[PDB]
Amino acid sequence: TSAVQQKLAALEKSSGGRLGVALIDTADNTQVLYRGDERFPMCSTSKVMAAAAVLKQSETQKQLLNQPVEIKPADLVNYNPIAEKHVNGTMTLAELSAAALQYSDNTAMNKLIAQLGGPGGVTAFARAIGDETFRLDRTEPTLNTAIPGDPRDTTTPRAMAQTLRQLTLGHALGETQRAQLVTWLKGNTTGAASIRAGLPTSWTAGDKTGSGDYGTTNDIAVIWPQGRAPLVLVTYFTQPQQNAESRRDVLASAARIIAEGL
Ligand SMILES: O=c1c2c3c(sc2ncn1Cc1nnn[nH]1)CCCC3
Structure with missing residues (x-):
C-alpha cells in the first residue's frame, strides 16, 4: 500500500461509495491502482470503445465516417441532445461518434452499437485490441442499470486504463x-467537473464521463501535464443505493x- 493508495482509501471512506482508480504514467510506464481489478459499471465511458471500434472499421472503409444513418422517432432513448435534432433525417457515423463522445448522446451510442452488430461487437473489438476484461452486454439506456455485483456492461480500472x-x-x-x-x-x-477539475489548470486533457443508477459517476482521461509525458487516468465510482446522487467531486x-x- 502506497501513500497515494492510502489517500484514495480515505477519500473512498468519506464518500460512502466504492472507488476504482487506474493511472498509467507514460513517463516510465508505472501505474497507480486502487481497486484496479474490481469490476465497475462503465455507463457512458463505454462510448469510447464503440467509437474506437467504428474508427477501426473506417481504416478499411475510407468513406465509412460519412455514411448516413437514419434517426427515427422510435430511436430516441433517455438522453439525446444531438440526435433529437435529426429525427426523421440522418446523421453520419462521424456525427454520431462526435455526439456520443462529446455530448454523451445515448441514441448516438445505440447507432454505433448497431453499426458494430450489437453489444457483442463492441466486446469483440475490445478483445481484438488485447482487452480481455471489458464487456458490453446491453444497449442504451439499460447498460446504465449499474446493479452492484452485476457483471453486465462492466470493466476494471486497470483494463480500461490500458485500453x-x-x-x-x-x-x-x-x-x-x-x-x-x-480530437474528439x-x-x-x-468533463469540467470530473477528473479535469482535480488537475492543474495549465494541463490539457481529453475525457469521457459516465453516469448511471446507483449514483455511478465515472471518467476516463488522457492527460498532457505541463512538462511531463502523458498520463492515462480512469476513475470509477459507484454507491450502494439505486437512487444515489452523482458525485463528480469524488472523481x-x-x-x-x-x-x-x-
Ligand atoms: O449526465 C447524465 C446523467 C445524470 C443522471 S442519469 C444520466 N445519464 C446521462 N447523462 C449524460 C452523461 N454525461 N456523461 N455521461 N453521461 C442522474 C443524475 C446525474 C446526471
Whole structure:
C-alpha cells in the first residue's frame, strides 16, 4: 500500500461509495491502482470503445465516417441532445461518434452499437485490441442499470486504463484514427467537473464521463501535464443505493490526489 493508495482509501471512506482508480504514467510506464481489478459499471465511458471500434472499421472503409444513418422517432432513448435534432433525417457515423463522445448522446451510442452488430461487437473489438476484461452486454439506456455485483456492461480500472492508452497514445488504431479519437476526446463538453477539475489548470486533457443508477459517476482521461509525458487516468465510482446522487467531486478529488502524487 502506497501513500497515494492510502489517500484514495480515505477519500473512498468519506464518500460512502466504492472507488476504482487506474493511472498509467507514460513517463516510465508505472501505474497507480486502487481497486484496479474490481469490476465497475462503465455507463457512458463505454462510448469510447464503440467509437474506437467504428474508427477501426473506417481504416478499411475510407468513406465509412460519412455514411448516413437514419434517426427515427422510435430511436430516441433517455438522453439525446444531438440526435433529437435529426429525427426523421440522418446523421453520419462521424456525427454520431462526435455526439456520443462529446455530448454523451445515448441514441448516438445505440447507432454505433448497431453499426458494430450489437453489444457483442463492441466486446469483440475490445478483445481484438488485447482487452480481455471489458464487456458490453446491453444497449442504451439499460447498460446504465449499474446493479452492484452485476457483471453486465462492466470493466476494471486497470483494463480500461490500458485500453485507453493503446487507443489514444499507442497503435491500436491507425494514426489518422488515433488523432481523430484524441480530437474528439479533447473536445468533450461534459468533463469540467470530473477528473479535469482535480488537475492543474495549465494541463490539457481529453475525457469521457459516465453516469448511471446507483449514483455511478465515472471518467476516463488522457492527460498532457505541463512538462511531463502523458498520463492515462480512469476513475470509477459507484454507491450502494439505486437512487444515489452523482458525485463528480469524488472523481475530481481522486484526480487531485493522483496529480499531487506525481
Ligand atoms: O449526465 C447524465 C446523467 C445524470 C443522471 S442519469 C444520466 N445519464 C446521462 N447523462 C449524460 C452523461 N454525461 N456523461 N455521461 N453521461 C442522474 C443524475 C446525474 C446526471
